[PDB]
């Protein structure tokens, strides 16, 4: 039984605390992405709108001709 608790608790507690912050860091980077992921969405929607705007713009010019 005992004797070997000396070599285990003072071993796989530190590496299992090397997880209890190497995860507590990720939870920033995840939402560091949703930060970016959302700006991206915002960016595309801006282009998408300019596109429709320019298509019409072209239809109007094309119409001015012929």
């Amino acid at each position: 039984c005992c004797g070997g608790i000396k070599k285990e608790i003072e071993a796989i507690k530190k590496e299992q605390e090397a997880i209890k912050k190497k995860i507590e860091a990720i939870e920033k980077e995840l939402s560091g992405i949703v930060q970016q992921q959302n700006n991206l969405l915002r960016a595309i929607e801006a282009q998408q709108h300019l596109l429709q705007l320019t298509v019409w713009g072209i239809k109007q010019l094309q119409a001015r001709i012929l």
Partner: antibody
Framework: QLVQSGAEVKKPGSSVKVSCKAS????????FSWVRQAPGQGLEWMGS????????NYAQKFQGRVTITADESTSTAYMELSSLRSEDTAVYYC??????????????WGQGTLVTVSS | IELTQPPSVSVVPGQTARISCSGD??????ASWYQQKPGQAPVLVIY???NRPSGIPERFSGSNSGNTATLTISGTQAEDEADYYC???????????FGGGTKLTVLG
């Protein structure tokens, strides 16, 4: 959102500008049309402009008589009809489309401008 | 391109009301419906593929079928008594075009 110039009286054969100030929002993202209504009658579409290029297109009935322009500095659209005759007496509306990309509908309107062409 | 509505349409309080816009070189996502009460700017009620703008009541729906737009009010009201217009754009010319309007009557 959209507010227009006040009501007018014009001699026949003369002309008139009408203005429309689009408040709060990006003027380059807008598309605008003028739509007039004769008393107790239907709406009739006159022309459109896209401010960010200033490309306009007009309904044939009014082609020659009507000009539409915009001024980004002041966020304003203008329509100007010349060689006025009685049938032009109408309420003139200013309308914004492309509120969103898939929306070809006129989501916002002016309060209207009554124009009266009597001698 | 030109649009065609029934000049008026009357209905019993709390029924389905149907205005039809018709013709001719088709829309579809270009088509819009508007309600105008006396002495007021039109208010967009339906646009494209059966879409309500914000704060618009669900009794309003947009229908479509080839040549034809149909605005449809479920369980009408007295306040729904108004003049209605359909509008769309000619894909060639990009001209805007309105129907001649339809006086929805709930006269009693």
């Amino acid at each position: 959102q959209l507010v227009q110039s006040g009501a007018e009286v014009k001699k026949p054969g003369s002309s008139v500008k009408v203005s429309c100030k689009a408040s709060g929002g990006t003027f380059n993202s807008y598309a605008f049309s003028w739509v007039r209504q004769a008393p107790g009658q239907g709406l009739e579409w006159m022309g459109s402009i896209i401010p960010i290029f200033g490309t306009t297109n007009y309904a044939q009935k009014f082609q020659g008589r009507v000009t539409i322009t915009a001024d980004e500095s002041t966020s304003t659209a203008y329509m100007e009809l010349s060689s006025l005759r009685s049938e032009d007496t109408a309420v003139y509306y200013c309308a914004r489309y492309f509120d969103t990309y898939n929306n070809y509908g006129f989501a916002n309107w002016g309060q209207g401008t009554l124009v009266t062409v009597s001698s | 391109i030109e649009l065609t509505q029934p000049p008026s349409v009357s209905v019993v309080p709390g029924q389905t009301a149907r205005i039809s816009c018709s013709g001719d070189n088709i829309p579809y996502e270009y088509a819009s419906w508007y309600q105008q009460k006396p002495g007021q700017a039109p208010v967009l009620v339906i646009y494209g593929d059966n879409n309500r703008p914000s704060g618009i009541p669900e009794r309003f729906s947009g229908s479509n079928s080839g040549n034809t737009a149909t605005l449809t009010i479920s369980g009408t009201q007295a306040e729904d008594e108004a003049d209605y217009y359909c509008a769309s754009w000619d894909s060639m010319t990009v001209d805007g075009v309105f129907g001649g309007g339809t006086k929805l009557t709930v006269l009693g």
